Amino acid sequence: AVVISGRKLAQQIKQEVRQEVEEWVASGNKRPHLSVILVGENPASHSYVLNKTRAAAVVGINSETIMKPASISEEELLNLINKLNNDDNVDGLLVQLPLPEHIDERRICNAVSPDKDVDGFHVINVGRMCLDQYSMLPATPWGVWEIIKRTGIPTLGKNVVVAGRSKNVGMPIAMLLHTDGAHERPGGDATVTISHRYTPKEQLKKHTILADIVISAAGIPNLITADMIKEGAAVIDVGINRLVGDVDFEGVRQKAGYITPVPGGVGPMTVAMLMKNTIIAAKKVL
Amino acid sequence: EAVVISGRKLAQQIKQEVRQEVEEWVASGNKRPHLSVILVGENPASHSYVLNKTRAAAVVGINSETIMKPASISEEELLNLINKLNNDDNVDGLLVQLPLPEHIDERRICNAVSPDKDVDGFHVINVGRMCLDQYSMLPATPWGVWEIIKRTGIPTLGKNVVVAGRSKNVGMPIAMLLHTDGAHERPGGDATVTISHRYTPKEQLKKHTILADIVISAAGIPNLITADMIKEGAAVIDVGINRVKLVGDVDFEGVRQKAGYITPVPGGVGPMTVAMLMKNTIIAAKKVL
Ligand SMILES: NC(=O)c1ccc[n+]([C@@H]2O[C@H](COP(=O)([O-])OP(=O)(O)OC[C@H]3O[C@@H](n4cnc5c(N)ncnc54)[C@H](O)[C@@H]3O)[C@@H](O)[C@H]2O)c1
Ligand SMILES: NC(=O)c1ccc[n+]([C@@H]2O[C@H](COP(=O)([O-])OP(=O)(O)OC[C@H]3O[C@@H](n4cnc5c(N)ncnc54)[C@H](O)[C@@H]3O)[C@@H](O)[C@H]2O)c1
Ligand SMILES: Nc1nc(N)c(NC(=O)Nc2ccc(C(=O)N[C@@H](CCC(=O)O)C(=O)O)cc2)c(=O)[nH]1
Ligand SMILES: Nc1nc(N)c(NC(=O)Nc2ccc(C(=O)N[C@@H](CCC(=O)O)C(=O)O)cc2)c(=O)[nH]1
């Protein structure tokens, strides 16, 4: 059972971006700049944001992390977002989630200018994604897709089970993998089952045993065990649980054809696909 | 034997409800609602459907007009008409009947309808909001599919649903509505939903439908669904309309012997589409969203 290294794949992707950025700068353009807004003291968020600005510097993208206390109000966050939207030096702008409960996450995401929305969370980017149009794709779902494509695991006509339906992770993953290879933004042409918190465990297993690709994005440890997987299927662990994913790694290790580890799997791919999006935003292709 | 769900009967009831809501709106002293339909070319199915929409408008007390244009119209001329209608305060709802000719970009057309008048739910903002489970103008055929299920009392939470078809105006919204959270702004069905399409091998489709409590076929393939694919007691909703006579995607007579529920073609989802459009038009006229 091949253990796919997300670290190695994201290394290639980041090298590609570093090349694309250097060539872009060589032709006289402004160096790309990414602004990350971070709210409060969530230790995972700080770690994740640090991994994003480390990767940016490595690929020639300038960055600033702007840290605010959790006691910030919604109006003050909106003010900051608006100043950044109007700062021509800023090409990409993202607000790290989760935000405190007194702040409306959807209003914040919709406040980032769409051309700077390297998260792909603005409702117009969500809509364009769901219509298979050119869009800024969200980093974690695009990272899952890249994991699958660059490992050469086929999707067209194959059975895919996604565990989870969150709008930032599980749902874009299901959208990418079932949609038409031939559309503006190609999809994976797979047969996709969406399961979630109301799928009975027994019904989950009855679909996973049929799956050539099981993608777990629920945030429950050991949700995916070896009896649910069929021999040779690919299992992609998006979950992050305090650290393990959603898959029983050691057991499923012995039945799957491929598997991603946690850490070092999807995580570093999320950071890598954000670099792609940032150079895309700098070029104003979309 | 399977209960046959009359979509025409359900739709007629829904139109009575819309008629009452429109009369109350007018009696309260608001302008009577007006729906404009733009029809391009001479697709006979399109002319049929638009005639059914304008009839239903008259039944429910909504003023209407179909504006017919030759297929040789240019995209810019269609956008000029759309802009004119966007700016007419007498028009509450505006829709452009699909499909359009090849030289007209359907997405740009749909995005040019002012979102408050977008009774189709095809504007990208309505699509985005729907995919986020936010309040939105829901597209008529998927909403009609949802209402057949809800008004017949067929359960969805925790159940297995297979949708055959992934088109952006029909199959994708049906899949979105049925799998999403019951507790969100726009509630969903909380079902476990398999999305199949033109590259799903016939043997793999069957392997999923046989587990399904609800099978929703919107492919446009006669006899795509047959009795061996359906588990006994399951609900089967036939969105397809295929000229062969008009048939659905379902082997009606065969699946009728195994399903718990089934919708006919014609007289099933079709009239439900027209009824849910009338609902969206009074919604648009009220500026609720
Ligand atoms: N780069 C990465 O590796 C990366 C990036 C982002 C998020 N994640 C992780 O992905 C996971 C989920 O993402 P989120 O934060 O958007 O999740 P969330 O907390 O919003 O919800 C997770 C989803 O799992 C579903 N679910 C719950 N119980 C289930 C069950 N028994 N069977 C099937 N589905 C079930 C829920 O309905 C929900 O849709 C988390 O672990 C999150 O940290 C990983
Ligand atoms: N009110 C109504 O009943 C209503 C309204 C609109 C359209 N329709 C009908 O619904 C059908 C489809 O409409 P559309 O606009 O989505 O059509 P479309 O041609 O845009 O889409 C066809 C869809 O079917 C899928 N498909 C094709 N072969 C398949 C197969 N073997 N298995 C599974 N999926 C397969 C395709 O991949 C695609 O997703 C047609 O019969 C159309 O006339 C009905
Ligand atoms: N706005 C916004 N908010 C968000 N919360 C996200 N998700 C968002 O950052 N996910 C994420 C998860 C893990 C890692 C990561 O670096 N994972 C490493 C190690 C992390 C750790 O040490 O815990 C790994 O899994 O190998 C990076 C990003 C996002 O993409 N955008
Ligand atoms: N803009 C736009 N274009 C579109 N093409 C649609 N779909 C869109 O009109 N579907 C539809 C299908 C069938 C009927 C209908 O009246 N069906 C009847 C009989 C139809 C017939 O005479 O053939 C039935 O199914 O029983 C009405 C609408 C839409 O909703 N919006």
Residue numbers in the entry:
A (entry chain B): 37 to 278, 289 to 332
B (entry chain A): 36 to 279, 288 to 332
Text taken from the publication that reported this structure:
Methylenetetrahydrofolate dehydrogenase/cyclohydrolase 2 (MTHFD2) is a bifunctional metabolic enzyme found in mitochondria, exhibiting both dehydrogenase and cyclohydrolase catalytic activities. The key distinction between these two proteins lie in their expression profiles: MTHFD1 is typically expressed in normal cells while MTHFD2 is abundantly expressed in immortal, embryonic, and cancer cells, but absent in adult normal cells.
Compound LY374571, originally discovered by Eli Lilly23 and the chemical structure later correctly determined by Eadsforth et al.,24 has been chosen as the lead compound for the development of selective MTHFD2 inhibitors. In order to investigate the binding mechanisms of MTHFD2 inhibitors and gain insights into their interactions with MTHFD2, structural biology studies were conducted to determine the structure of human MTHFD2 in complex with 16a, as well as compounds 16d, 16e, 16g, and LY374571. These investigations were conducted under conditions that included the presence of NAD+ and phosphate, and the resulting cocrystal structures were resolved at a resolution ranging from 2.04 to 2.54 Å. As revealed in all cocrystal structures of MTHFD2 in complex with LY374571, 16a, 16d, 16e and 16g, the 2,5,6-triamino-3H-pyrimidin-4-one headgroup of these inhibitors was observed to form an extensive hydrogen bond network with MTHFD2. Additionally, it participated in a water-bridged hydrogen bond network with the side chains of Ser81 and Gln132, along with the main chain of Leu133. As revealed in both the structures of MTHFD2/16a and MTHFD2/LY374571, the amide moiety adjacent to the phenyl ring formed the hydrogen bond with the side chain of Asn87. Comparative structural analysis of MTHFD2 in complex with compounds LY374571, 16d and 16e revealed similar interactions with the protein around this phenyl region, maintaining π–π interactions with Tyr84 and hydrophobic interactions with Tyr84, Ile276, Thr316, and Val317.
